Amino acid sequence: FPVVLVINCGSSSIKFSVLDVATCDVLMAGIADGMNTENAFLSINGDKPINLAHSNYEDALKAIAFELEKRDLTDSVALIGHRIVHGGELFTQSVIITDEIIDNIRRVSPLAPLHNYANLSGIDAARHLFPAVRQVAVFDTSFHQTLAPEAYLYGLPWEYFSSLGVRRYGFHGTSHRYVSRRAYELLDLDEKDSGLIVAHLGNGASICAVRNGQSVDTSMGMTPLEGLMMGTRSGDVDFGAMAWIAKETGQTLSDLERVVNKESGLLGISGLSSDLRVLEKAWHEGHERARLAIKTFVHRIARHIAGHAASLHRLDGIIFTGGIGENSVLIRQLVIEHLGVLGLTLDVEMNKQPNSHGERIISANPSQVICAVIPTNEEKMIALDAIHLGNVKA
């Protein structure tokens, strides 16, 4: 009964899952959190929250490894999959990790210095702990490497692209890929003759247009700040406005980078929370800024969905996914009603079904475009790539 260990290291945490190679079912999950804070801690579901204290990434993972040793899983770990944020232009698909891959991850890392160095720390820790286990790197950008230059270039001087690698990359790739593949089955579409828009709505949010199986446009940019307005992230913002705000309040670009990442979006408009459920309850109570935050979020989603459709020869389906997309009855219906121009018709009773209903069609018969909810599973997609790669002679 081989398993895959899936690791996702952030700057403050290590999330992990252990998946059965048979069913790609989760057998165990957990989080080493408060990483590189005075008090780091390991929590496994479904168990009690262990404490870790002064622990580096290798320490946390050794603790995780000892939790697996405890449960007699160590010898079943046949593959390790690592989530890497940014693969630049170098990675167009998931890979077996070797010294070359590592060097190439380092070379692109200046494009996402928060995220990527934590991801590389996870790799270094895992290679130490599991040296006779094949490990794979799955990149949140790779799916989008099929964008044409007209879709990835910014209107900046060519030198920024050609010397510095400034271009749109896009993120959520692993989700957009997994969900689009699920959609061909659910909607009974020919992958090679098809047009989808995926809306990954979570605390991070992005749109991806998938044409004949390939990403051809996406809403995030060189970084995850561009595009949709999100939980604490601004999404698209007029650079002139930002320059005007700098000159007017005396803020540096660094202050502003913090504002636009951590103090903006649903949190920034509402003055209340980044959490959609708090805002829906607040609107329901009369709170006007909550309502504005939500309408604004909706309006920007619709604007991006329709704009991404421009990269399709034909629009077959629109697919909601992510924590919001999967769970928000209200956000889906408001978006879909904002897209009446595309001939969409919602089946409201199907829209009201909770997410326990999994992969499901929420558009009514007369709809010109099929609308659906497909739960995303980045761990499973990571495992699947690892299992495919486990057949390869490296």
Ligand X SMILES: Nc1ncnc2c1ncn2[C@@H]1O[C@H](COP(=O)(O)OP(=O)(O)NP(=O)(O)O)[C@@H](O)[C@H]1O
Q: Which residues pair with 215 in a beta bridge?
A: 210
255 included as an active-site residue: no
User: Does residue number 196 form part of the binding site for a copy of itself (CB under 8 A)?
Assistant: no
Question: Is residue 305 a contact partner of residue 320, using CB atoms and an 8 Å limit?
Answer: no
C-alpha dihedral, 265 to 270 to 272 to 278, nearest 10°: -90
- DSSP codes, 313-374: SS--EEEEEHHHHHH-HHHHHHHHHTTGGGT--B-HHHHHS-GGG-SEE-B-TT-SSEEEE-
User: Does residue number 1 form part of the binding site for a copy of itself (CB under 8 A)?
Assistant: no
Q: Measured from the CB atom, is 254 or 391 closer to a copy of itself?
A: 254
Scored b (16 or more CB within 10 A) or e, 86-119 reads: bbbebbeebbbbeeebeebbeebbebbeebbbbb
Is 36 annotated for ligand binding? no
Contacts to a copy of itself from residues 223-242, by CB under 8 A: 223-226, 229-230, 233-242
Does residue 286 have a cis peptide bond before it, meaning omega lies within 30 degrees of 0?
no
User: Does residue number 313 form part of the binding site for a copy of itself (CB under 8 A)?
Assistant: yes
Is 201 annotated for ligand binding? yes
User: Does residue number 202 form part of the binding site for ligand X (CB under 6 A)?
Assistant: yes
User: Does residue number 203 form part of the binding site for ligand X (CB under 6 A)?
Assistant: yes
Q: Measured from the CB atom, is 73 or 114 closer to a copy of itself?
A: 114
Cα–Cα distance for residue pair 320/374, rounded to 1 Å = 6
- Kindly indicate which of the ranges 171-179, 279-287, 290-298, 358-366 contains the residues binding a copy of itself, using the contact rule CB under 8 A: 290-298
The least CB distance from residue 137 to a copy of itself, in Å, is: 22
User: Does residue number 299 form part of the binding site for a copy of itself (CB under 8 A)?
Assistant: yes
The least CB distance from residue 321 to a copy of itself, in Å, is: 20
Q: Of 71, 277, 357, 388, which one interacts with ligand X (CB under 6 A)?
A: 277
126 touches, from ligand X, a copy of itself, none (C-beta below 5 to 8 Å by class)? none
Count of residues interacting with ligand X (CB under 6 A): 13
Among residues 20, 75, 140, 255, the one annotated as catalytic is: 140
Please provide the distance, in angstroms rounded to a whole number, between the alpha carbons at the two ends of the chain: 23
Q: Token pair 């929250």 is at which residue?
A: 49
Catalytic (active-site) positions:
140
Interface with ligand X (CB under 6 A) = 200, 202-204, 231, 275-277, 322-324, 327-328
